Design a binder for these strands. Structure first.
Ligand SMILES: Nc1ccn(C[C@@H](CO)OCP(=O)(O)OP(=O)(O)OP(=O)(O)O)c(=O)n1
Ligand SMILES: [Ca+2]
Ligand SMILES: [Ca+2]
Ligand SMILES: [Ca+2]
Lengths: 218, 419, 1005
DNA sequence: TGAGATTAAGTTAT
DNA sequence: TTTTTTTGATAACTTAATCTCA
């Protein structure tokens, strides 16, 4: 739960002790890019950059990874919006409410679920357009994903072509599932049977099963 | 990702759950599925296995040789037979304890096992005991049904089962020798059972108990006894005429029993059993010399080399005796069941089974020979390497090669017309 | 556009997917043609009417036969015939992808289907008619029926081409250029337009130069522009700001060039230019489709290629540029790395290896040295290439060790005349190469001035022109045209696929011509199979002439001779015992007579089997033999083209192309035994290997101990076919045209797959060559049969065979004599290996030459040779250990980085990972790097070596051996001593010396 | 504290 | 506002690290 300071707007690096061999290199990886990153207006909150780096990562067994925060608005944590309107979150919630058996809900908020953590590959975005900050975050995203992979047992990513080069991105082998994005034509995410896959992979790797309907918010 | 991958990997998980209860086919399937999983997902929690030692002690407690106090639940009683033990996990062959040997089921036992196991999926495996070329219903471990109804259904399918008795005990009564003797008398079951393993309701694990007294005796002679058509069982006698049962030939080989020498034999109230855990080339010829040159070790039993002609061919094909080849073809084409079996089998295998030769020994003897074959028939044979003749079994088999070649020629000639 | 010639083919990646063709007319104008691209499926006539959504288009393919090529094992001679079914087929075109269940021929590409079905070659000249063309833009046309539009083909005609060879130089302070903090200093362009004009111009960022320096440069004649519109390409040096520089670069990159050529520019140059453009200004490099309908931004994408052996893993990486305008962006680094094998793949190494010549001393000087070159000094064409590179060259390497600045140059009409700056080398003939320089870019950037800026501009334009020199030297345009013609692929993807993909075009053409479809259903179990046979050498030193006879295209010719194809395999018969084996052999010898069938005895695939016979039918030609015949014809044509060449560059290009086609023909066989291939055939590969082994055994048996005397030649064994009886004379007495006074004897000494080494009890070189020619003539008509032909390779002298695959010798070619100069050749020894040393090979050569001479003169009256050789070794080793005068370069090792390892704790993984985590220069997944053993200096000589890999460190480009760090000479000395010991005969002294110097037991071969 | 065999990796000839 | 096409074989030698045996 410690923190370190830098010479750039966010300078709010509150991090946990189990994230120790990350910050000492993230400082140099971010100093050379913050000057050009902070010259534009983004659509996360600028203080919401190093907010998931203080959580204990040796508690989760499956990691769901996003490629980019919402092009419009944004909170700071992936796949969370207590203003439920978006199509991707609707498609995510429908196919899991059918599986679990709960029909009455007011959103999902996947972050609160124990044993899973939502991850955003690119820690920043811009209003109106997506994937407009890839160059500023490429090496940082590589290092962060490598560290997260080193601790978790199975990784889940959204986007076939968007995550088509993830095997070379990591040097340590790991169980990886790359799923179709829930915005493509024909709604292919309906056919995506991946939550059962990741669960049964947890039982196959002698890990404690993770309840999935816990995160529902009423 | 897809449903097919989910089914494949969940079948892999199910196979991983039952790993000790596997044979060559199941090991190959498990390895292939592990390879597919680690190729698709870049990592899998389980690895490859090649040895896979068969262990059953995880479901059975340590043996008990002392009177003990009991009171939990009902007391369904189940005896343990003496002999080789085989395991039928699911739709497989018989697996021997330790080494994963694949026993050759005749026919009816495999069908009975398949029909018993097809009823449900809560049974862990099926346990069988073979003694002097016969099967018996051993312990039926199951996580869904109590073994009583498995025993009843197995009995009504066509195989034999031991009787069961249920008694309720209130206080912690001290089970002793007298209760064991009384319940084994009430079991009847004249077959030479060694131990008794009663189940415990609620507790999934089973328990085994047996009481015995050590003894030392003297060896008089070793003799073979007929228990079938060219199947012989070894046996020994004492001064008073007591019979010491031997489970199989391998037990005698490992015991290294010597004629006119004192031995240690485990004695019980009814019958006594020689104790193992006392080289191989010396005994494998010494016992053969003592019991007679005209004998050989047919796998688990003893077999006698004799005459081989029309009678053996008719007996193996389950047909009546005849005189000439025309009667042979008529009697084997009259029923369409036998001719289909003959068509699906080769001449070499059919003749080898007709004469009851071993597999590996006969194959090596044939591979260490030379033949002159004309019109798909054998007319001249000779030995090229005499090293393989060192084994007494090889010499005993080779001494009657004329009968084998006559049977081979007859079968080839008849199959030339059966097509 | 009536008479057009194709340049490139590309696709549209929008919602409305289109295919495009770029072409040029005779006058020089560019024409773009558009087609609607579909998805192609092949169905049966019965399936065709059972499609609830009617197909958009369907074309009848005629009647074709489908054959199951699954292989089964038979324990007897009751083999069922192969399942084949003849039916009418339909080729259906769908605007969007479908999911037909029972669809065949699904292993071919859609662009391949377009080419083959429409009858259009990727490269060629056509007469497009205006009936099927409609104008949609200025220069862009639309076509709905490409089959009818391309019905007329015309002979090839030459067309002008546009080239952009570009290089950049970025300022770097300590470690590496960073796009966020380090700017671009120089940008050099070689610009060639459709008018043939060749303009060389360099742009210099003026923000790194002082105002007085800018004034001095503009007085000297450097243009100082202020905006984009004030730039002219007719000047040589242009001073400008970084924003204007990037805007000019973006403007040049958006033009419709035929080729944009870099060296490692897809990973560094283009990415840097782009990222700087969006950082400083925010603009984008916009690429547009020919119809101006879909526009994309420049974004370099990575393509990872995985291995195929022992857990695949990532094996190589490439970087490509997305563009929809028909321009081909080419990186020479990837092309050279994929096609060549070298110690290093840097620009300096490739330039030194390619641009070399022989110079004759003509003048001396106090510190200068004048050379000269022409066709009289070196081979024809070398001097011209050296002069062409010398136009922009600045530094020359002499004797592969001296780096010298060029003082003055003078291009002649036949060669070059250059004066260098080196001491007076006291010889007459030397070697001049274009290689490494002695310029420290880090130091020059720290003291940046006007003169240093001009020097950097000259170096940058030299690199940009070196791109063009390597483009012309390697024949990339000719190779691209040949690959597009042969593989039936667009020009932009000729060098992007391996053998599994480049054969699908000709395979589909052959399948359509033969009207055959191959299907497999059962799974493919994998079993190892035996390979070729290598004979054990009989002697180490021979002192006699050895004659070499080599089979021509052994495995393709074996497949052609045996008709080895998956669909022609009658069956496989296996046996468990000798009775069944003999019965099956008796039945088989009469059931399948060998005028039509061929039976191959292979090793059993399972331990329980003792025999395995593969039966093949030669009545109908197989699919694989036809492809092999096509590739052999191609290779023969390219060899004929090679033999009629006089220039060095043309000869090198033709040799490379014929080698590529030979490797393709071999890869056809290799894929026939590849499990993950559609042409998988275990039995065919086993049969081909067995037949090759039989052929080499037959040659060795017939050649061993075959003396000649008078006019007769007597072979050892009868000239009988080793497979079946044939209509040839088997008498080993052969009339020869050699004179009557010749008497010699032969003895086979070695063999490898298809090569036979036959020695002769003679020393006269002309005599041996004449006898070898006569024998090669004689053993091709009387000994061999059908399509089996061998050729006499060369004569070997001073043959020193260390092992079964390593030997060094002097080579006399077929067209040579006694006075002809030999060529020293090494095969597998510690002189061609890329990871032994440089200090090692020179000593190995010297000691081997000394040993050969000393054995030739006559020695071995005592221990003798060992004593003096070990004394020399001790003296040299102690001198090297004390003086330490050798540079670090002589003790450098090379290794390729890859991610194919059984365990994640491998030291090779750890070394590269740790280097990458602490160095901005990142080693890619297929990059070859340098490493060496370095130990603390205070450590004295070590007798017992414990750990070796822990001392490995990567010497990227600028590592400095500090005072505390020294080269760990122990490993190199131990390896050298171990290699030398195995050459000698006496042992006791060898083990004694190894124990004394190091303290171990020297292993003996 | 040595000898010997075995496995993994790199590299070349064919 | 997100998505189709890959992948030649075996044989022989050398060196370091690991396992096993006097
Ligand atoms: N790339 C290769 C190289 C060699 N071989 C083994 C064998 C068959 O290809 O080599 C025999 P050759 O017939 O190709 O003969 P070689 O390689 O010497 O070629 P050539 O001198 O005829 O050009 C192979 O299988 N693949
Ligand atoms: Ca450069
Ligand atoms: Ca340069
Ligand atoms: Ca050859």
């Amino acid at each position: 739960m410690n923190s370190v300071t830098i010479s750039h707007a966010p300078y709010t690096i509150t991090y946990h002790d189990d994230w120790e061999p990350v910050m000492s290199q993230l400082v140099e990886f971010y100093n050379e890019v913050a000057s050009w990153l902070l010259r534009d207006e983004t659509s996360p909150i600028p203080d919401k950059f190093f907010i998931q780096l203080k959580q204990p990562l040796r508690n989760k067994r499956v990691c769901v990874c996003g490629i980019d925060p919402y092009p419009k608005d944004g909170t700071g944590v992936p796949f969370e919006s207590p203003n439920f309107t978006k199509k991707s979150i609707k498609e995510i919630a429908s196919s899991i409410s059918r599986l679990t058996g709960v029909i009455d809900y007011k959103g999902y908020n996947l972050n609160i679920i124990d044993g899973v953590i939502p991850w955003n590959y690119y820690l920043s975005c811009k209003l109106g357009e997506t994937k407009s900050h890839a160059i500023y975050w490429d090496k940082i995203s590589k290092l962060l994903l490598q560290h997260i992979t080193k601790h978790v047992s199975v990784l889940y990513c959204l986007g076939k072509t968007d995550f088509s080069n993830i095997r070379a991105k990591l040097e340590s082998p790991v169980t990886t599932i790359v799923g179709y994005h829930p915005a493509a034509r024909d709604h292919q995410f309906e056919k995506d049977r991946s939550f059962e896959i990741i669960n049964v992979l947890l039982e196959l790797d002698n890990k404690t099963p993770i309840n999935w309907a816990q995160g529902f918010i009423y | 990702t897809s449903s097919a991958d989910l089914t494949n990997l969940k079948e892999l998980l199910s196979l991983y759950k039952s790993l000790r209860f596997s044979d060559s086919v199941a090991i190959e399937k498990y390895n292939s599925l592990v390879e597919w999983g680690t190729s698709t997902y870049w990592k899998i929690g389980v690895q490859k296995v090649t040895n896979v030692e068969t262990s059953i002690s995880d479901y059975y407690d340590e043996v008990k040789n002392k009177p003990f106090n009991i009171d939990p639940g009902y007391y369904i009683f189940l005896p343990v037979y003496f002999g080789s033990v085989f395991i039928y996990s699911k739709g497989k062959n018989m697996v021997e304890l330790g080494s994963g040997n694949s026993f050759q089921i005749p026919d009816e036992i495999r069908s009975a096992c398949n029909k018993v196991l097809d009823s449900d999926n809560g049974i862990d495996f099926l346990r069988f005991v073979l003694l002097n070329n016969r099967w018996i219903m051993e312990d039926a471990i199951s996580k869904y049904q109590s073994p009583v109804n498995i025993f009843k259904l197995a009995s009504e399918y066509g195989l034999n089962i031991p009787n069961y008795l249920e008694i309720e005990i209130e206080e912690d009564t001290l089970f002793d020798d007298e209760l064991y003797s009384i319940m084994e008398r009430s079991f009847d079951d004249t077959f030479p059972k060694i131990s008794i393993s009663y189940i415990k309701l609620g507790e999934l694990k089973r328990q085994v108990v047996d009481f015995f007294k050590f003894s030392f005796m003297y060896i008089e002679s070793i003799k073979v006894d007929r228990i079938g058509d060219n199947i012989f069982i070894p046996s020994v006698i004492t001064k008073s005429g007591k019979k010491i049962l031997v489970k199989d030939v391998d037990h005698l080989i490992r015991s290294k029993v010597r004629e006119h020498t004192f031995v240690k034999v485990k004695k019980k109230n009814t019958f006594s059993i020689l104790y193992d855990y006392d080289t191989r080339g010396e005994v494998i010829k010494r016992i053969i010399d003592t019991i007679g040159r005209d004998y050989y070790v047919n796998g688990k039993y003893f077999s006698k080399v004799g005459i081989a002609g029309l009678k053996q061919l008719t007996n193996k094909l389950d047909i009546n005796e005849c005189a000439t080849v025309d009667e042979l073809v008529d009697e084997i084409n009259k029923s369409g069941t036998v001719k289909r079996k003959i068509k699906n089998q080769s001449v070499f295998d059919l003749s080898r089974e007709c004469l009851g030769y071993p597999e590996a020994d006969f194959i090596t003897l044939v591979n260490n020979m030379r033949f002159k074959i004309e019109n798909c028939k054998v007319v001249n044979f000779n030995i090229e390497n005499t090293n393989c003749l060192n084994n007494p079994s090889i010499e005993t088999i080779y001494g009657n090669f004329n009968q084998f070649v006559s049977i081979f020629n007859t079968v080839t000639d008849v199959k030339k017309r059966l097509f | 556009g009536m008479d057009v010639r194709c340049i490139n083919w590309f696709e549209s990646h929008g919602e409305n997917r289109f295919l495009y063709l770029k072409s040029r007319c005779r006058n020089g104008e560019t024409v773009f043609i558009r087609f609607p691209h579909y998805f192609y499926y092949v169905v049966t006539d019965e399936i065709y009417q059972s499609l609830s959504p009617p197909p958009f288009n369907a074309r009848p393919m005629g009647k074709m036969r489908t054959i199951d090529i699954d292989e089964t094992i038979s324990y007897n001679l009751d083999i069922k015939d192969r399942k084949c079914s003849v039916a009418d087929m339909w080729l259906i075109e769908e605007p969007k992808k479908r999911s037909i269940q029972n669809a065949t021929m699904d292993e071919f590409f859609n662009i391949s289907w377009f080419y083959i079905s429409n009858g259009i070659s990727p490269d060629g000249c056509y007469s497009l008619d205006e009936q099927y063309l409609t104008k949609i833009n200025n220069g862009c046309y639309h076509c709905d029926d490409p089959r009818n539009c391309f019905a007329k083909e015309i002979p090839r005609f030459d067309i002008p081409r546009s080239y952009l060879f570009l290089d950049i130089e970025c300022h770097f302070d300590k470690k590496f250029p960073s796009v966020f903090i380090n700017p671009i200093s120089h940008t050099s362009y070689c610009y060639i337009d459709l008018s043939g004009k060749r303009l060389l111009f360099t742009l210099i960022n003026e923000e790194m130069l002082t105002e007085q320096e800018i004034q001095e440069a503009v007085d000297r004649g450097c243009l100082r522009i202020q905006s984009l519109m004030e730039m002219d390409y007719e000047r040589e040096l242009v001073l400008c700001s970084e924003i204007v520089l990037l805007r000019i670069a973006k403007q040049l990159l958006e033009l419709t060039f035929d080729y944009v050529v870099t060296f490692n520019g897809h990973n560094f140059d283009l990415r840097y230019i782009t990222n700087r453009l969006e950082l400083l200004t925010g603009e984008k490099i916009i690429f547009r489709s020919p119809d101006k309908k879909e526009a994309v931004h420049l974004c370099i994408y990575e393509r990872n290629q995985s291995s195929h052996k022992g857990v695949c893993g990532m094996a190589n990486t490439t970087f490509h540029v997305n563009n929809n305008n028909g321009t081909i962006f080419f990186d020479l680094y990837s092309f050279i790395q994929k096609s060549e094998k070298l110690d290093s793949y840097k620009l300096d190494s490739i330039s030194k290896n390619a641009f070399s010549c022989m110079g004759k001393v003509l003048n001396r000087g106090v510190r200068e040295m004048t050379f000269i070159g022409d066709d009289t000094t070196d081979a024809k064409g070398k001097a011209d290439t050296f002069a062409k590179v010398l136009t922009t060259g600045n530094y020359v390497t002499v004797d592969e060790d001296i780096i010298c600045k060029v003082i003055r140059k003078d291009i002649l009409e036949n060669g070059f005349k250059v004066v260098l700056s080196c001491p007076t080398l006291p010889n007459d003939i030397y070697k001049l190469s274009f290689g490494k320089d002695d310029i420290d870019l880090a130091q020059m950037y720290k003291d940046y001035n006007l003169n240093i800026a001009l020097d950097m501009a000259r170096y940058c334009i030299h690199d940009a022109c070196l791109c063009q020199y390597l483009w012309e030297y390697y024949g990339v345009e000719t190779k691209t045209d040949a690959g597009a013609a042969t593989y039936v692929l667009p020009q932009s993807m000729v060098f992007e696929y391996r053998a599994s993909t480049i054969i699908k075009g000709p395979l589909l053409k052959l399948l359509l011509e033969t009207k055959t479809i191959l299907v497999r259903s059962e799974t493919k179990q994998k079993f190892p199979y035996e390979g070729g046979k290598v004979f054990a050498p009989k002697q180490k030193m021979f002192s006699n002439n050895v004659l070499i006879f080599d089979y021509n295209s052994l495995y393709p010719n074996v497949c052609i001779f045996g008709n080895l194809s998956p669909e022609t395999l009658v069956g496989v018969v296996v046996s468990t015992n000798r009775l069944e084996e003999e019965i099956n052999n008796q039945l088989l010898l009469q059931k399948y007579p060998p005028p039509r069938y061929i039976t191959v005895h292979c090793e059993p695939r399972l331990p329980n089997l003792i025999s395995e016979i593969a039966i093949f039918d030669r009545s109908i030609e197989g699919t694989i033999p036809r492809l092999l015949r096509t590739f052999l014809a191609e290779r023969a044509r390219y060899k004929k083209m090679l033999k009629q060449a006089t220039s060095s560059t043309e000869k090198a290009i033709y040799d490379s192309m014929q080698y590529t086609y030979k490797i393709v023909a071999n890869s056809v066989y290799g894929l026939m035994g590849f499990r993950n291939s559609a042409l998988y055939s275990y039995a065919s590969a086993k049969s081909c290997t067995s037949i090759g082994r039989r052929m080499i055994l037959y040659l060795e048996s017939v050649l061993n101990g075959a003396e000649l005397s008078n006019g007769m030649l007597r072979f050892a064994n009868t000239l009988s076919n080793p497979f079946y009886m044939d209509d040839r004379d088997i008498n080993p007495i052969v009339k020869t045209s050699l004179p009557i006074d010749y008497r010699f004897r032969f003895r086979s000494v070695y063999g490898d797959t298809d090569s036979v080494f036959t020695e002769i009890d003679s020393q006269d070189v002309d005599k041996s060559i004449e006898i070898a020619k006569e024998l090669e003539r004689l053993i091709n008509s009387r000994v061999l049969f059908n399509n089996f032909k061998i050729e006499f390779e060369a004569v070997y002298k001073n043959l020193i065979m260390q092992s079964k695959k390593k030997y060094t010798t002097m080579k006399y070619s077929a067209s040579s004599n006694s006075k002809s100069v030999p060529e020293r050749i090494n095969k597998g020894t510690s002189e061609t290996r890329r990871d032994v040393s440089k200090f090692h090979k020179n000593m190995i050569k010297t000691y081997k030459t000394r040993l050969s001479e000393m054995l030739s003169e006559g020695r071995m009256n005592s221990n003798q040779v060992c004593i003096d050789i070990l004394r020399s070794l001790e003296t040299d080793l102690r001198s090297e250990f004390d003086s330490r005068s050798s540079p670090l370069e002589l003790f450098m090792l090379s290794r390729m980085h890859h991610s194919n390892y059984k365990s994640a704790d491998n030291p090779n993984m750890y070394l590269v990972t740790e280097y990458n985590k602490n160095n901005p220069e990142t080693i890619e997944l297929g990059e070859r790097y340098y490493f060496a053993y370095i130990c603390p200096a205070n450590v004295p000589w070590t007798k017992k070596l414990v750990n070796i890999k822990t001392y490995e460190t990567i010497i990227d480009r600028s590592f400095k051996l500090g005072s505390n760090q020294r080269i760990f000479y122990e490993v190199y000395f131990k390896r050298l001593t171990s290699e030398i010991v195995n050459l000698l005969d006496n042992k006791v002294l060898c083990i004694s010396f190894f124990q004394r110097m190091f303290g171990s037991r020297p292993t003996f071969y």
